[PDB]
Amino acid sequence: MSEEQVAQDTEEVFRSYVFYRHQQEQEADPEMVTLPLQPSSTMGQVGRQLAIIGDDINRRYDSEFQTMLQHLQPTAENAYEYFTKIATSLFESGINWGRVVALLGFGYRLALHVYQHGLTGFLGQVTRFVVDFMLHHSIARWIAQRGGWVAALN
């Protein structure tokens, strides 16, 4: 399992998550509900299974959490400054798969809030913010080592 291999695969691991997590969060934003899914990749399965294991824990703190993102009020420029900044701390303690789904859940939550505040077409950047950060902060070399994203299917 190569490092940026896991990187390139992070492209649609995310696109899957957001797709399936929104289809259930409603239980809206057409930038994600329409988010086109590839055919015939296991990386799509990874984004669905993690979409539905964290969903419940991702159902209590949604009130407290996004209340912070307003007082923070992030734009389309400091977005990567803010993203990296919070995610560097989310891992400054210790690494594990539970927190790897916590970064994607922040990736689902930042995507959702920018549409809801007038930022359109920025899901195409909250993706890239998620892929670059991991290949340049030792997280993709954490995933490739354990077999990769497919290893998360447990």
């Binding site: 294991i53 964290g54 824990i57 991702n58 703190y61 407290e64 959490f65 912070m68 993102l69 007082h71 923070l72 803010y82 900044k85 919070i86 995610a87 560097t88 701390s89 989310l90 400054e92 303690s93 594990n96 798969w97 539970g98 927190r99 790897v100 789904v101 916590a102 970064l103 859940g105 922040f106």
Partner: peptide, 18 residues
């Protein structure tokens, strides 16, 4: 600055709960 510490520590709980 401080709000920043606040998001990272939440997801952390969520992450470690996951």
């Amino acid at each position: 600055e401080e709000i920043i510490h606040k998001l990272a520590m939440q997801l952390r709980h969520i992450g470690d709960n996951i």
